[PDB]
Design a protein around this ligand. Structure first.
Ligand code: SF4
Length: 393
DNA sequence: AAGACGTGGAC
DNA sequence: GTCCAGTCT
């Protein structure tokens, strides 16, 4: 931790001064700063910080304002359906986030009388989907509590400023980072300080090509001070790799490679009054892509003939007997999840001329807005481009 | 206390 | 292509 109170003070002043001048104009920042009711403000921050988990700012811009305009308050979100939530979340990824946001709103309404808890400890304790980061973000930004937070951005800044080379995922290191953040967080402007540290990590102290020469905390940064000395060395010196400079920190966490999986899926198309329709069925409410809609799918089979037989069996559960000779193998889609690389073999079957529950026939316009994973949107685009004679293009 | 859980923007 | 932008169990 920082040993000199003078430095802690300078860190805060420099960072906040830079932030007040350089911060990006972000929709949830404006909305939180401008909302005067505390339960509305806290809800607005809550939504944005859930959407931002493992998701880039540029992506969340496309979702946040639409969410807040539809469901401006806890109570609006609490009364909505999970199907509606999943439609709005389609494309954001990690769909349990949307589900827990709505469950959390229901819990605040039903069990806490509509009142958002006002401290990071009670937010974390009471709200599913709200871990230590989101709770401290809501508490500092919405309520002004002097709690510091560590996300990926802040961990990178702190590991460079303090030259921490050990593995940041380790319990010892993660503990040091949270203590540093709690030491540094400005008591009078805790929310802006936390947003400023994240902003610095996102726009200046970046994963690669950090802009140290424009950085507000350069003179306090240990990695920078070591790089400045080594820039001058007129002779080589023969785990710190001089050619990486400050990007030596943090130690690059290596992801476990993804499990390979394969599946076969079929787009079934039929004419309709208001346009052609395709068949969607609903996934189970647990596990991968829980509760989202998809084209009927079966697991992989060790021969083409077996694969077609399984697919037609699955398809017939939902549509009745179908012409097997019209089934076409159209292509494949290789879709990456964090832990699975899933290869879908795409089939189509267009019919030339009742619906069990758990199935839906949708037009092209209805499908574009439906609660479907991006994997299935890719599948549909293969069908669109490759199925002879389709009208869905 | 590693693995489940989506997707895409940058380089 | 590879990396990075949290929560829960
Ligand atoms: S001087 Fe460079 S490495 Fe240090 S905090 Fe600033 S941008 Fe990051």
């Amino acid at each position: 931790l920082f040993r000199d109170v003078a430095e802690v003070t300078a860190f805060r002043g420099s960072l906040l001064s830079w932030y007040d001048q350089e911060k990006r104009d972000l929709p949830w920042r404006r909305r939180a700063e401008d909302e005067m009711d505390l339960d509305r403000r806290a809800y607005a921050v809550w939504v944005s910080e859930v959407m931002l988990q493992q998701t880039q700012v540029a992506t969340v811009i496309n979702y946040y304002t639409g969410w807040m305009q539809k469901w401006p308050t806890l109570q609006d979100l609490a009364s909505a359906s999970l199907e509606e939530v999943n439609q709005l979340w389609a494309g954001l990824g990690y769909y349990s986030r949307g589900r827990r946001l709505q469950e959390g709103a229901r819990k605040v309404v039903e069990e806490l009388g509509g009142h958002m808890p006002r401290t990071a400890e009670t937010l974390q304790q009471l709200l599913p989907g709200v871990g230590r980061y989101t709770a401290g973000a809501i508490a500092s930004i919405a309520f002004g509590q002097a709690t510091g937070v560590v996300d990926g951005n802040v961990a990178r800044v702190l590991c460079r400023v303090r030259a921490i080379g050990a593995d940041p995922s380790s319990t010892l290191v993660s503990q040091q980072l949270w203590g540093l953040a709690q030491q540094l967080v400005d008591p009078a402007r805790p929310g802006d300080f936390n947003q400023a540290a994240m902003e610095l990590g996102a726009t200046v102290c970046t994963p690669q090509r950090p802009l140290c020469s424009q950085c507000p905390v350069e003179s306090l940064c240990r990695a920078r001070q070591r790089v400045e000395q080594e820039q001058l060395l007129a002779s080589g010196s023969l785990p710190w790799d001089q050619t990486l400079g400050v990007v030596n920190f943090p130690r690059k966490a290596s992801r476990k490679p993804p499990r390979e999986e394969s599946s076969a899926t079929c787009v079934l198309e039929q004419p309709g009054a208001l346009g052609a329709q395709i068949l969607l069925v609903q996934r189970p409410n647990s596990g991968l892509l829980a509760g989202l809609w998809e084209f009927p799918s079966v697991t992989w089979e060790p021969s083409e003939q077996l694969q077609r037989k399984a697919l037609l069996q699955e398809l017939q559960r939902w549509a009745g007997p179908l012409p097997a000779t019209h089934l076409r193998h159209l292509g494949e889609v290789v879709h990456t999840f964090s832990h699975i690389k899933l290869t879908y073999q795409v089939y189509g079957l267009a019919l030339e001329g009742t619906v069990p529950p758990g199935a839906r026939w949708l037009t092209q316009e209805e499908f574009h807005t439906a609660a479907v994973s991006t994997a299935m949107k890719k599948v549909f685009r293969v069908y669109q481009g490759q199925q002879p004679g389709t009208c869905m293009g």
